[PDB]
């Protein structure tokens, strides 16, 4: 027969990893505002997400598809001021 | 040779000044070579920003020696969280 | 470039004024190379130029081979004497 | 890659517009700080005539 | 100086008759229960497997009795062991070795004497080369009789040691001080 | 901040308890392979056994031998455990579902892994015994030897992907798990992972040496807990490397059709269900690999030091160099160099 | 945040000074090797701070994972004698140490300048009172990082260097065998 | 302050907390016999460092060049498409050169510990 | 000058079985000189037997090789029977032969499984100790003890077999062959087992004779000698 | 240009553009809608993009300040195409960029929505999606049926809309 007591610890491990991963997925989606995570993002994606922040009012990953930008988009441009790398 | 190649495989920060200086050296000869002094100067400037640092030192010395107010569109520093707020 | 320069100078002084053991000499060599690589990598970043980083990679590989050969030499030296004196060279 | 190629011109046009705006702004600010002194704020540190956005700001 | 008198009680019950009443008593009882539960459940002996008794000890770990079902694991190193089981005749040549192994055990530590040889010398009690009971060399917590004791007898002795563990006062003892 | 803390606590609890229950699973599985029961008494069905061992050890006196660098002997197991646990920060249980989503995640795995030999190396120096030094030397030699094998297999895999992001490497296996075209590499990676964790049959140091029980012979109390925990944590982490490099990580089957039947729009219910499916796939692969570690412990006798050094340097490494040649050759022949 | 996080580079510098001093002053040479490992972790920290985390990981992989391991292996197998730092042995060096410290540090800061006047040469060293302006553009459409670019130039523009390095590694194999193995 | 940095700080804290609990709760009663090194219950004499075999040195020393060889392929696998056929040829040449060194190591029997004592195979001859 | 490094392998060591103090001298890897120190279990048995009657001395033989109790008893009984000039009856002789071979099985289970456990094959020990449990039940049913039976005595055996024993021994025998096959499945063709055993501890036939080796230690070198066939008892 | 290193702060400039420079609208789409529209923007605005880049090359260093009028044309053309999409094909366009937001911005995860978007944009804007640089033998991947690489979860709304279009006959 299949020894079930010998499978109980494997079941505990499987359940712990499964539940932890499901909880982590829910927490990630909730942190993202209802969409899946971005992964493997290069410098291009990073700049695009910064521009998105300038367009949607700082609302994380919220998207807007209106053709014309608001007025504030002209004046909320950011340059970075980097300390001297000594 | 890897001369001219940036950290991302394109052209490095001072490539343009270097290329114009190399155009100069290619067109002149040893006797005429000093005619290319400005180009090389520009190249070194890009590399080390020495004249720019001197000019900023002068402007900042005059700035800290003034009690009169400044009336010009200013620079504003914001938190990275506040990119695009309001 | 400060951190690399200080590391190199102090490692060199430790190598020179070492009067304690031979392992300190090996370590000071390795750390002088580390300091040189740090200086180089900072300049590579400030120029946005791959040549500095390429040289730094080559320096790392050569430091590995130099370590292997130096320790082989030390072991061959040990084989005849069975000990390393605090002047062991 | 072709999607990014087709977006490159508009993004770079927006960024160039900003580069011009902020460079001219900084020149105006610096010339106002240097008013009353014998220093040319418009003179480039380079010898070519080309546009050179500032590197190197004063820490804010 | 100052304190000049005493209010000490005269019929304070002894540790074997004292029972928890004050919820600090109950807290310390719960803590002692946890510690003693861990001591019973993780019962790691170092084997001094001297002679034929060791064979019966081997059979305790064999499938019929399966000692590790109770949490018992035998350890080569005294540093990782809580229990010493003296299983076999202890000779005079061996006595300092046994004392040395016992002294290297970290605390807390207990000793089980297993079999007539270890208990008092057994069949070799009148020998010129035999220690007459391992309690001439080390303190002993439980004595298991038999030549050899059966596997079940050794398990019974382990249960007796676990009963002693389960009834130890640790934080309650400190509270008495 | 709060979400970050909650996520870290959940991940850490799951990892630490999985490690605790792996020891119970090993005891039970070995037992039933040996026609016995294993722990069934400390807790119901023996489910509190590991916690009893942990509390017992936490209350056990620490001994510092006389000739011993006591600081080095108390910090060596601590650093091995710390590096062992740090390795978990890059393991994803779904696309981007990780504590550290690093574009250099593979490199992180290799570097933290290469910090894993210092426990054996420093433990022998902890005392002043020549038995200890020789045993530590051998164990260190075995560890770096099989580190070479593991690194080679990593590089062979990256030849197919051209990315150091672990999520991306998993994502490319939606077409096929890499164990299918590279099955001998699955065998070799498992063998080398067993050797790299110094598990049977690669357990020279602990079971045939001058000291009775390896270089942990002198350890009692919490240092012993650190070494034991680090060992089992590395078993699971190296199995996770196996899973994402060759077994498709959190991928099981295409559930697009089933999800389109079950749900009509995105919700926390559909997101939770997808997360559960992904994590359960990765977990079941980890379970099979842990079971295999225990099964191999059950079936075989030990190598000697000479045998295992020969196995690594004369049999495995030449094959891996031949594979270094043949994989880019196949990519060139069919014009299948992976893009970035 | 800001106060600590602004001076992270300065903290790495101070820790590096301290770690070097501890390397030289260690009683046990194994402890000296451990302080060398500490210095390499500090160097990896600095490299991450200036944007080169890939070199942080490479340094951890190669100098700690390989070179420091070989160091420890050797000091474990070999019988090393060492004396302790003491006034009787080492105070005699203090004058030369001080002169050399000042001269070498100043010259190592001056070799970077292009000013004719020596005092200006030294002064330029401490002349970064300004912030660099980081700007964006959109000309790079590929996902090319430092490692990829290194591979690109090392395997094509500088392939000869790679093959010569292969010879150097060949030496790192053949030589140790030649002087540590006794044939026949 | 992302999850990565918080997790990396948290691990050593937990290790130190377990160590502190053990120090706080376990008894501590050192004494001379307990403080002895455990060597099977006996005591051994202090000895000059053991003479070791050269293969012990050679495994550790040869680890470094082979490790560097393996790690030098990281730039190739991260740039394979960009350098495609030219770099494929170059990396093949590099690998072949390193394989010649592997061949040298294999043929010299550099990592073999030879059992010094071997059975005597000489014939027995009698001078009649 | 070669300088040996000296290790005390045992007594408190798993392979040294608790009581062997094997002082070994190594030059690196290899054993150059070995010095087994014994007497950690010297009990003075031979002195004690001189103060006992023959019947009182019989149980000392149980405790010599304490996995082979009944064959130890058998050798003492045969010696005393030869000096007494008496004859064991036929059923007694058959019981002694049957329990001698049961004892041989018990001994070989212990020895082979302990040998495998020392090399690192941990599982044959558990499988074989269950068979040992089954055979020890026969020991206990004829003698009242699991190990030190004191069953074989000068003259024969102390009691007759109980009523249902031959049937139970037969039923154990119908499955012991499979029990042996599974151990052989784990060991006989395993390449690791061969790496640990082949050309290890070689003894030539002439040296085996000169050293006083017997049993398998002798039969392994090619010499067909076995007292059961050469001098039947 | 490299990303910022150890310590940096973002700073905003409050000045206005110099009044000599003619003002222009800015594109208001975020990354997902822009990626969804990118091929149509390319198709319509290729001449202006090419002219802008050629001006920048010919300026040989002063490109930002010398091509401002060309850049103004580029941005106006992009705004025009996005406005046309918002007037004629908004539902399908929203399908496509919301799908992209769920699929790590990978076009392979959104083929069903993209099919509807392409048909709409072609029928009402006369723009065609096309991948430059392929031979007639080579098949564009977005037109491939039965691809090796598929999304983990086909988008719900997109699956429903695709099936409905197949019933209606539009697709
Ligand atoms: C997968 C492992 C099983 C594979 C072989 C199954 C053999 C078998 O069932 O007959 C036993 C049989 C013993 O005969 P028997 O005892 O006289 O009669 C059996 C009982 O009447 C009947 O005994 P039974 O009631 O155990 O069998 C019915 C069984 C299933 O019956 C089947 O055989 C169905 C076909 C196989 C599917 C297995 C379903 C259950 C899988 C276990 C995981 C549960 C989730 O259904 C169950 O009861 C499942 C156990 C209850 C749940 C266990 C607790 C789960 C804890 C969490 C675990 C999570 C981690 C995993 O032995 C054999 O026939 C030969 C077995 C040799 C197997 C060779 C290797 C097979 C392939 C490799 C598998 C690697 C593992
Ligand atoms: C539910 C429980 C949680 C589950 C598992 C965790 C462990 C639970 C078990 C909790 C308590 C049992 C363990 C307590 C225990 O053995 O110390 C006993 C004393 O006993 C008490 O009276 C000392 C008071 C004990 C304080 C109890 C604190 C309990 C929570 C610990 C966090 C022995 O130390 P001890 O007298 O030699 O006293 C000390 C002590 O060991 C060292 O810290 C000192 O530095 C050293 O000088 C030494 O003298
Ligand atoms: C420092 C010791 C060595 C550093 C190890 C480098 C590990 C590494 O690769 O860090 C990368 C990671 C950010 O890298 P990246 O993948 O580009 O993040 C983008 C995510 N979308 O980095 C991170 O995510 C977090 C930063 C980790 C290193 C911070 C340590 C601070 C060093 C200053 C010490 C002060 C004294
Ligand atoms: C020891 C552990 C060995 C266990 C390995 C189990 C391998 C079985 C899973 C293989 C997974 C893989 O890489 O490809 C699976 C993939 C699934 O197809 P699907 O879910 O419909 O998604 C389509 C998008 N490609 O596409 C396939 O279905 C292809 C067919 C499966 C791969 C070949 C399976 C036959 C050989 C199995 C041998 C496995 C090792 C023994
Ligand atoms: C500050 C310098 C380095 C800067 C930052 C550190 C960089 C990262 C370090 C990586 C960790 C591995 C390397 C650690 C260096 C080892 C330190 C060391 O040398 O310890 C050994 C030494 C023993 O010497 P000892 O004989 O006891 O001196 C007595 C004098 N009366 O003991 C000593 O010399 C003094 C006691 C040292 C105690 C070390 C405690 C920390 C242990 C490492 C923890 C790592 C972090 C976790 C969030
Ligand atoms: C995270 C948890 C950290 C807990 C560490 C706390 C250590 C407290 C233990 C202690 O008091 O010092 C123990 C140390 C033992 O060494 P020692 O007694 O000198 O020599 C024994 C050789 N048989 O004795 C020492 O020499 C002290 C070494 C460390 C110095 C720390 C001083 C602690 C003072 C306590 C107040
Ligand atoms: C995060 C949780 C896991 C990590 C924490 C560390 C492990 C703690 C394990 C506690 C379990 C235990 O101690 O079991 C409970 C023990 C049982 O004692 P017993 O049955 O009399 O012993 C019998 C020994 N025999 C079988 C040999 C005879 O004490 C008690 O009933 C008192 C109540 C304790 C409540 C503590 C709850 C902890 C939450
Ligand atoms: C995942 C966790 C699943 C295991 C929990 C069930 C075990 C149990 O609750 O068992 C009962 C325990 C005491 O166990 P016991 O004294 O050994 O009795 C077992 C009877 N026997 C001897 C016949 C087998 O009671 C308790 O105090 C439970 C409090 C423990 C809290 C710590 C949980 C850690 C998470
Ligand atoms: S008590 Fe009996 S069985 Fe145990 S060792 Fe002594 S003689 Fe042997």
UniProtKB/TrEMBL annotation, chain D:
Function: Complex I functions in the transfer of electrons from NADH to the respiratory chain. Accessory subunit of the mitochondrial membrane respiratory chain NADH dehydrogenase (Complex I), that is believed not to be involved in catalysis.
Coiled coil: 10-37
Family: Belongs to the complex I NDUFA13 subunit family.
Source organism superkingdom: Eukaryota
Entry protein name: NADH dehydrogenase [ubiquinone] 1 alpha subcomplex subunit 13
Annotated localization: Mitochondrion inner membrane
From TrEMBL, chain E:
UniProt entry tagged with the keyword Iron: yes
Biased composition (Polar residues): 2-20
The keyword Metal-binding is assigned to this record: yes
Region annotation (Disordered) ranges: 1-20
GO molecular function: 4 iron, 4 sulfur cluster binding; metal ion binding; NADH dehydrogenase (ubiquinone) activity; oxidoreductase activity; quinone binding
Enzyme class of the recorded protein, top EC level: oxidoreductase
The protein, known as: Subunit NUKM of protein NADH:Ubiquinone oxidoreductase
Species this protein is from: Yarrowia lipolytica (Candida lipolytica)
Parent sequence residues shown: 34 to 210 of 210
TrEMBL record, chain F:
Name under which the protein is recorded: NADH-ubiquinone oxidoreductase chain 1
Keywords: Membrane, Mitochondrion, NAD, Oxidoreductase, Transmembrane, Transmembrane helix, Ubiquinone
Transmembrane residue ranges: 6-25, 37-58, 70-90, 102-123, 143-163, 175-192, 212-232, 244-263, 275-296, 308-334
Any single GO BP term: aerobic respiration
Catalysed reactions listed for this entry: a ubiquinone + NADH + 5 H(+)(in) = a ubiquinol + NAD(+) + 4 H(+)(out)
Domain of life of the organism encoding this protein: Eukaryota
InterPro entries with a match to the protein in the record: NADH_UbQ_OxRdtase_su1/FPO, NADH_UbQ_OxRdtase_su1_CS
Gene Ontology, cellular component aspect: mitochondrial inner membrane
Major subcellular location class: membrane
Record EC number: 7.1.1.2
Record's bilayer topology term: Multi-pass membrane protein
Catalytic EC class: translocase
Modified positions (N-formylmethionine) in chain numbering: 1
HAMAP family the record matches: NDH1_NuoH
Protein family per UniProt: Belongs to the complex I subunit 1 family.
GO MF annotation terms: NADH dehydrogenase (ubiquinone) activity; NADH dehydrogenase activity
Localization of this protein: Membrane; Mitochondrion inner membrane
Protein species of origin: Yarrowia lipolytica (Candida lipolytica)
Automatic annotation (TrEMBL), chain I:
A GO molecular-function descriptor: oxidoreductase activity, acting on NAD(P)H
Keywords (A to Z) from UniProt: NAD, Oxidoreductase, Translocase, Transport
GO cellular component, one term: mitochondrion
EC number: 1.6.99.3
One GO BP: mitochondrial electron transport, NADH to ubiquinone
Family: Belongs to the complex I 49 kDa subunit family.
Name of the protein: NUCM protein
């Amino acid at each position: 027969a299949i020894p079930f007591e010998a499978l109980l610890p494997y079941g505990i491990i499987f359940g712990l990893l499964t539940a932890g991963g499901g909880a982590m997925q829910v927490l990630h989606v909730y942190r993202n505002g209802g969409v899946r995570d971005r992964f493997a993002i290069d410098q291009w994606d990073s700049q695009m997400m910064e521009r998105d922040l300038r367009l949607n009012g700082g609302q994380g990953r919220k998207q807007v598809d209106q053709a014309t930008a608001p007025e504030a988009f002209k004046h909320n441009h950011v340059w970075k001021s980097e300390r001297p790398l000594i | 040779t890897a001369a001219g190649i940036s950290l991302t495989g394109g052209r490095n920060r001072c490539f343009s000044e270097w290329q114009s200086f190399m155009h100069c050296t290619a067109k002149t000869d040893a006797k005429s070579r000093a005619q290319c002094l400005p180009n090389f100067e520009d190249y070194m400037e890009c590399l080390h920003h020495t004249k720019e640092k001197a000019r900023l030192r002068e402007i900042e010395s005059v700035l800290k020696q003034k009690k009169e107010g400044l009336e010009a569109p200013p620079v504003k520093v914001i938190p990275v969280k506040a990119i695009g707020l309001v | 470039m400060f951190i690399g320069t200080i590391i190199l100078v102090l490692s060199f002084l430790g190598f020179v004024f070492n009067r304690r053991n031979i392992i300190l000499a090996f370590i000071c060599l390795e750390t002088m190379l580390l300091g040189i690589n740090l200086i180089l990598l900072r300049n590579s970043v400030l120029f946005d130029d791959i040549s500095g980083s390429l040289f730094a990679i080559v320096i790392i590989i050569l430091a590995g081979v130099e370590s292997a050969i130096g320790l082989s030499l030390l072991v061959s030296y040990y084989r005849l004497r069975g000990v390393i004196n605090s002047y062991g060279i | 890659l072709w999607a990014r190629i087709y977006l490159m011109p508009l993004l770079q046009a927006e960024e160039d517009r900003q580069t011009v705006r902020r460079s001219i702004a900084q020149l105006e600010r610096e010339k106002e700080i240097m008013k009353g002194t014998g220093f040319d704020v418009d003179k480039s540190v380079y010898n070519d005539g080309k546009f050179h956005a500032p590197a190197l700001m004063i820490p804010p | 100086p100052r304190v000049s008198s005493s209010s000490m009680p005269t019929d304070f019950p002894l540790p074997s008759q004292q029972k928890p009443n004050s919820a600090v008593d109950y807290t310390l009882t719960t803590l002692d229960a946890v510690a003693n539960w861990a001591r019973q459940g993780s019962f790691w002996p170092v084997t001094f497997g001297l002679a034929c008794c060791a064979v019966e000890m081997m059979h305790v770990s064999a499938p019929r009795y399966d000692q590790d079902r109770l949490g018992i694991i035998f350890r080569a190193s005294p540093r990782q062991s809580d229990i010493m089981i003296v299983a076999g005749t202890l000779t005079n040549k061996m006595a300092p070795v046994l004392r040395q192994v016992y002294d290297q055990m970290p605390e807390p530590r207990w000793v089980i004497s297993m079999g007539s040889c270890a208990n008092g010398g057994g069949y070799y009690h009148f020998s010129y080369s035999v220690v007459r009971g391992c309690d001439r060399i080390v303190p002993v917590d439980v004595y298991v009789p038999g030549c050899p004791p059966t596997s079940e007898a050794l398990m019974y002795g382990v249960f007796q040691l676990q009963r002693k563990m389960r009834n130890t006062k640790i934080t309650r003892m400190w509270y008495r001080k | 901040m709060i979400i970050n803390i909650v996520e870290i606590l959940i991940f850490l609890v799951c990892v630490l308890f999985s490690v605790a229950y792996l020891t119970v699973a090993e005891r039970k599985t070995l037992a039933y392979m040996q026609r016995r029961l294993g722990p069934n008494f400390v807790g119901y069905y023996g489910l509190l056994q590991a916690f009893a061992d942990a509390v017992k050890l936490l209350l056990k006196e620490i001994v510092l031998p006389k000739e011993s660098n006591y600081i080095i002997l108390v910090i060596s197991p601590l650093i091995t455990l710390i590096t062992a646990l740090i390795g978990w920060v890059v393991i994803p249980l779904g696309p981007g579902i990780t504590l550290g989503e690093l574009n250099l995640g593979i490199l992180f795995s290799l570097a933290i892994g290469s910090l894993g030999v210092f426990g054996s190396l420093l433990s022998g120096w902890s005392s002043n015994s020549k038995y200890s030094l020789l045993g530590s030397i051998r164990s260190t030699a075995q560890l770096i030897s099989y580190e070479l094998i593991l690194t080679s297999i990593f590089i062979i895999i990256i030849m197919f992907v051209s990315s150091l992001n672990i999520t991306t490497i998993i994502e490319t296996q939606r077409v096929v798990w890499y164990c299918i075209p590279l099955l001998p590499l699955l065998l070799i990676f498992f063998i080398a992972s067993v050797a790299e964790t110094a598990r049977p049959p690669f357990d020279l140091t602990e079971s045939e040496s001058e000291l009775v029980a390896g270089y942990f012979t002198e350890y009692s109390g919490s240092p012993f807990v650190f070494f034991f925990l680090a060992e089992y944590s590395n078993i699971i982490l190296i199995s996770a490397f196996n899973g994402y490099l060759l077994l498709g990580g959190y991928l099981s089957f295409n559930y697009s059709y089933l999800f389109n039947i079950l749900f009509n729009d995105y919700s926390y219910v559909s997101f939770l269900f997808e997360g559960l499916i992904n994590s359960s796939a990765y977990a079941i692969k980890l379970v099979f690999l842990m079971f295999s570690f225990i099964w191999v412990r059950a079936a075989f006798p030990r190598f000697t030091y000479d045998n295992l050094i020969n196995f690594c340097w004369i049999i495995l490494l030449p094959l891996l160099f031949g594979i270094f040649l043949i994989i880019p050759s196949t990519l060139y022949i069919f014009d299948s160099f992976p893009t970035l | 945040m800001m106060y600590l996080t602004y001076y992270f580079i300065e903290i790495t510098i101070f820790l590096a000074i301290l770690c070097t001093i501890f390397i030289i002053s260690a009683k046990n040479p194994m402890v000296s090797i451990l302080y060398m490992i500490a210095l390499f972790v500090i160097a990896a920290m600095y490299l991450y701070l200036i944007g080169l985390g890939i070199f942080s990981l490479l340094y951890i992989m190669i100098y700690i994972g390989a070179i420091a391991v070989l160091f420890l292996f050797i000091i474990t197998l070999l019988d090393i004698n060492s004396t302790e730092l003491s006034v009787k042995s080492n105070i005699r060096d203090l004058p030369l140490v001080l002169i050399s410290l000042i001269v070498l540090t100043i010259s190592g800061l001056m070799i970077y300048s292009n000013d004719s006047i020596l005092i200006n040469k030294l002064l330029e060293a401490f002349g970064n009172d300004y912030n660099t302006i980081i700007t964006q553009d959109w000309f790079n459409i590929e996902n090319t990082t430092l490692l990829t670019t290194i591979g690109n130039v090392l395997l094509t523009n500088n392939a000869f260097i790679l093959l010569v390095l292969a010879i150097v590694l060949l030496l790192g194999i053949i030589g140790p065998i030649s002087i540590t193995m006794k044939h026949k | 302050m992302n999850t990565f940095i918080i997790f990396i700080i948290l691990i050593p804290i937990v290790g130190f907390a377990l160590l502190a609990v053990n120090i706080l709760l376990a008894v501590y009663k050192p004494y001379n016999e307990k403080l002895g090194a455990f060597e099977c219950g006996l005591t051994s004499f202090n000895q000059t460092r053991l003479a070791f075999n050269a293969a012990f040195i050679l495994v550790a020393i040869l680890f470094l060049p082979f490790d560097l060889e393996i790690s030098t392929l990281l730039p190739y696998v991260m740039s394979i498409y960009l350098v495609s056929n030219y770099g494929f040829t170059i990396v093949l040449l590099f690998l072949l050169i390193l394989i010649i060194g592997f061949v040298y190591e294999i043929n010299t029997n550099a990592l073999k510990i030879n059992k010094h004592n071997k059975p005597n195979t000489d014939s027995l001859i009698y001078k009649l | 000058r070669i300088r040996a490094f000296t290790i005390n392998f045992g007594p408190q060591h798993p392979a040294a079985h608790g009581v062997l103090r094997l002082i070994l001298e190594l030059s690196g890897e290899e054993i150059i000189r070995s010095d087994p120190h014994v007497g950690l279990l010297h009990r003075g048995t031979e002195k004690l037997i001189e103060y006992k009657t023959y019947m009182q001395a019989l149980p000392y033989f149980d405790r010599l090789d304490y996995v082979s109790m009944m064959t130890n008893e058998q050798v003492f009984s045969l010696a005393v029977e030869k000096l007494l000039n008496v004859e064991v009856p036929l059923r007694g002789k058959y019981i002694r032969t049957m329990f001698g071979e049961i004892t041989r099985v018990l001994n070989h289970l212990m020895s082979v499984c302990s040998h495998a456990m020392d090399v690192g094959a941990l599982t044959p020990f558990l499988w074989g100790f269950e068979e040992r449990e089954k055979l020890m039940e026969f020991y206990e049913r004829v003698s009242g003890a699991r190990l030190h039976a004191a069953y074989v005595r000068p003259g024969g055996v102390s009691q007759d077999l109980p009523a249902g024993l031959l049937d139970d021994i037969y039923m154990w025998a119908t499955q012991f062959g499979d029990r042996l096959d599974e151990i052989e499945e784990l060991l006989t063709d395993n390449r690791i087992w061969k790496l640990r055993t082949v050309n290890i501890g070689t003894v030539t036939a002439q040296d085996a004779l000169n050293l006083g080796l017997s049993g398998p230690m002798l039969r392994g070198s090619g010499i067909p000698f076995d007292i059961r066939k050469n001098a039947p008892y | 240009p490299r990303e910022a290193a150890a310590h940096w702060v973002p700073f905003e400039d409050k000045a206005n553009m110099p009044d000599n420079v003619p003002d222009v609208v800015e594109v208001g789409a975020t990354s997902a809608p822009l990626l969804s529209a990118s091929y149509f923007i390319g198709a319509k605005c290729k001449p202006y993009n090419d002219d802008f880049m050629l001006c920048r090359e010919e300026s040989q260093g002063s490109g930002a300040i010398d091509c401002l009028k060309e850049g103004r044309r580029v941005t106006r053309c992009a705004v025009s195409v996005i406005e046309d999409i918002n007037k004629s094909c908004l539902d399908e366009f929203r399908l496509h960029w919301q799908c992209l937001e769920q699929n790590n911005h990978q076009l392979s995860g959104c083929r069903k929505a993209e099919a509807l978007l392409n048909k709409c944009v072609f029928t009402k804007l006369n723009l065609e999606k096309k991948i430059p640089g392929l031979r007639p033998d080579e098949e564009p991947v977005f037109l491939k049926k039965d691809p090796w690489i598929k999304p983990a979860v086909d988008d719900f709304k997109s699956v429903r809309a695709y099936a409905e279009a197949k019933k209606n006959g539009t697709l």
